[PDB]
């Protein structure tokens, strides 16, 4: 398709035909002011701020939605454009209220910025003295999104986002004329895993974070690039620190993975990093109370127990442990002579060796390219919401055939439910069902199996057959087999060489135990050997931490620099934005100190020494930001099938106050459905 030649501002430009004027102007470099246009939303002409003049224009055209045509001449900065822009902003600023100082988007508001650049500087609106402005009742929409609609400019970003990206469909417009409002005609709660993203979409401060309300201004605050850790998507984050306080979280545009959206859990659970925190080493007395002690006694006491326990030790890594903590943990236990190093979330026995057996080989970006997707009892909407919306983008732009072989769930879009019984996956893998024919006929089939199922029971057979069928489904440059990992450390464990299954470590019968912030109930001292001495090296004092005889504080993920391998497999680096509290240290530093206290020092006294020890173990694993290919790959009832299940998953999640409010609010709206009836 030959590219057209068009003189954007007296500069020849190349555009594939059908390109919009705006999309061409950015190509060359000029930017047109927009309000209702966004890269990842349907096109509409609402603001009329993107207007621009083309030579011999009877009518200025909206660049945002104007396909370019041969031999045009777009006069971006010609006076007619300037006349248009000023008039449009005089209009927008008529009856926007005088609420910048109390509006949380102050100093971050596109209306302010575009008023500065492209608007006038005098108020022709004289009617403030006669009849004033308009006003609109605010809406109740949830415990997360504070709504002040009297500032809205009806850009419909919220309308379009909800309808398409999240498919909630419950937020819309009403009325004619200047009294047109936005919201829900009757009071409801906009409850949705992706609901946070509307706060970033609303160009004006009509929708804003309830928790991060009034707390700080953008000019004061400081930005730190980082990566989300609460979900195995590993989305890129910009942690918004100000003076040793993580005020909020924002998505960092990494369209290969992050997609620029962000789930509610990652967005809002940041408060969890300020409550139930461990700020002092503790050791369990004969009274048993775990009084506070100092680092000297603590590690010395721990080194005492390890030496005299009798060389029967285990380490069970949690789910928020960075790969450095795993490697430091493993190396120390190899000095001690114990290879019992399990991970909480179990996995396939005897298939953990080929890299592609525990990843998303389908290139999460490529998921949107998928054509026929088969989700065997693997609810993405609450297991990987960012992955879920990628699928919906496919479902909307490429006719994605989405079947299900699990229990009932709702994916925000139609999906064919073939049953639940695990015998269905076998018949499909043989290719004896109608959707199997669809899979055959497709060009980008995908088969997604949730890691929970792979650890459920006797599921290694299920995986083996699934890999067996993927052999035929393989199309060049495309590996169908997909595994939505859940914890952000599981893939880290596999690349260092752990075992899988906390019960595995218990079955070893160790005299001492190590727990990298492992706050899952999968291990209980009752279920442990009675004499088993228990050491916990995690940040939040959660219940799993409650059952240890020694409790070493740790700095949470935002506070520590670590490496996390995301689901698909790229390794990514957190950066520390906040000084840790109390005596908290880095996890890989706690282990290193303990080794040298025992008398079996590790070789890595610095992060780089450790990062080179990982380089030894996996050169692929230190090529940050890249993804080495792995090639060939090798009833059903699941959790997180409702939002109520989703909000309370991890220790940080339970720690957060806002999430607890969210759970209560959803329960109450359900009760309203029962009783308001």
């Amino acid at each position: 398709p030959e590219k057209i030649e068009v003189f954007v501002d007296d500069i020849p430009v190349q555009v594939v035909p059908g390109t919009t004027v705006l999309q061409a102007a950015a190509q060359i470099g000029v930017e047109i002011p927009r309000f209702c246009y966004h890269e990842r939303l349907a096109v509409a002409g609402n603001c009329r701020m993107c207007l621009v003049e083309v030579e011999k224009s009877p009518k200025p055209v909206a660049a945002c939605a104007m396909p370019v045509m041969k031999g045009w001449r777009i006069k971006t900065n010609s006076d007619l454009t300037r006349k248009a822009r000023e008039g449009v902003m005089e209009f927008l600023l008529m009856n926007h209220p005088l609420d910048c100082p109390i509006c949380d988007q102050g100093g971050e508001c596109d209306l302010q910025d575009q008023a500065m650049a492209f608007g006038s500087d005098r108020s022709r609106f004289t009617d403030i003295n006669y009849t004033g402005k308009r006003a609109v009742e605010d809406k109740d929409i949830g415990p997360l999104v504070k709504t002040i609609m009297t500032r809205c400019i009806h850009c419909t970003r919220c309308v379009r986002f909800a309808s398409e990206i999240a498919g909630v469909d419950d937020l819309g417009t009403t009325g004619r004329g200047n009294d047109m409002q936005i919201g829900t005609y009757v009071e409801k709660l906009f409850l949705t895993e992706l609901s946070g993203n509307v706060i970033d979409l609303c160009p004006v401060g009509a929708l804003t974070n309830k928790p991060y309300s009034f707390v700080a201004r953008p000019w004061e605050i400081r930005k730190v690039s980082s990566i989300d850790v609460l979900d195995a998507v590993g989305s890129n984050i910009v942690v918004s620190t100000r003076t040793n306080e993580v005020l909020r979280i924002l998505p960092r545009e990494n369209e290969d993975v992050n997609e620029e959206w962000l789930a509610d859990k990652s967005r809002f659970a940041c408060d969890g990093l300020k409550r139930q925190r461990l700020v002092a080493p503790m050791v369990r007395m004969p009274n048993g109370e775990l009084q506070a002690v100092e680092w000297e006694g603590a590690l010395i006491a721990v080194a005492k127990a390890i030496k005299a326990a009798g060389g029967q030790i285990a380490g069970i890594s949690g789910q928020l442990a960075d790969l450095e903590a795993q490697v430091a943990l493993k190396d120390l236990l190899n000095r001690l002579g114990s290879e019992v190093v399990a991970t909480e979330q179990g996995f396939i026995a005897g298939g953990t060796d080929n890299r592609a057996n525990y990843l998303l080989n389908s290139t999460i970006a490529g998921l949107e390219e998928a054509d026929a997707v088969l989700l065997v009892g693997t609810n993405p909407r609450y297991e990987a919401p960012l992955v879920n919306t990628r699928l919906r983008k496919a479902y909307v732009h490429n006719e994605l055939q989405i079947a299900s072989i699990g229990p009932k769930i709702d994916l925000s879009y139609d999906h064919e439910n073939l049953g639940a019984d695990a015998a269905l996956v076998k018949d499909v893998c043989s290719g004896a069902h109608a959707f199997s024919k669809v899979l055959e006929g497709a060009k980008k089939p995908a088969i997604i199996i949730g890691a929970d199922l792979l650890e459920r029971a006797d599921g290694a057979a299920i995986h083996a057959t699934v890999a067996e069928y993927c052999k035929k489904l393989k199309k060049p440059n495309w590996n169908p087999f997909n595994v939505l990992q859940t914890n952000a450390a599981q893939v880290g464990a596999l690349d260092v060489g752990y075992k899988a299954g906390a019960q595995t470590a218990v079955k070893a019968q160790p005299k001492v135990l190590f727990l990298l912030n492992a706050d899952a109930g999968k291990v209980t001292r009752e279920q442990l050997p009675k004499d088993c001495f228990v050491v916990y090296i995690g940040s939040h004092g959660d219940n799993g931490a409650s059952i240890a005889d020694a409790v070493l504080p740790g700095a949470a993920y935002t506070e520590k620099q670590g490496i996390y391998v995301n689901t698909e497999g790229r390794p990514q680096q957190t950066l520390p934005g906040v000084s840790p509290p109390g005596m908290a240290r880095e996890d890989w530093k706690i282990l290193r100190a303990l080794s040298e206290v025992v008398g079996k020092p590790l070789p890595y006294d610095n992060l780089d020494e450790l990062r080179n020890r990982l380089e030894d173990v996996a050169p692929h694993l230190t090529r940050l930001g890249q993804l080495e290919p792995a090639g060939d790959a090798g009833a059903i009832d699941i959790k997180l099938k409702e939002l109520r299940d989703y909000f309370m998953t991890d220790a940080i999640s339970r720690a957060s106050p806002t999430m607890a409010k969210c759970i209560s609010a959803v329960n109450k709206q359900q009760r309203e459905n029962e009783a308001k009836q």
Partner: protein, 89 residues
Amino acid sequence: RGDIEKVTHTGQVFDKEDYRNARFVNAKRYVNENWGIKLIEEVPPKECTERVVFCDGGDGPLGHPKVYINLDKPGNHICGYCGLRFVKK
């Protein structure tokens, strides 16, 4: 002394065993006696007829910027700036 006992309206009292108490062994811990929360509570909620009213809080250019507050909802409506309260009924 009561000076180092009072609860600042912001909500702080030095813990009874907290070394930062020491700084007041010889100086007063000023705490203000007017708490805005109580005062605005006392002020009664003004009422009007029109669906939409306007507040500047103070007077003329001696108050906060003019703001329009709709009253169609049943409840009260608090001025964002001054905390004045409006009710149409």
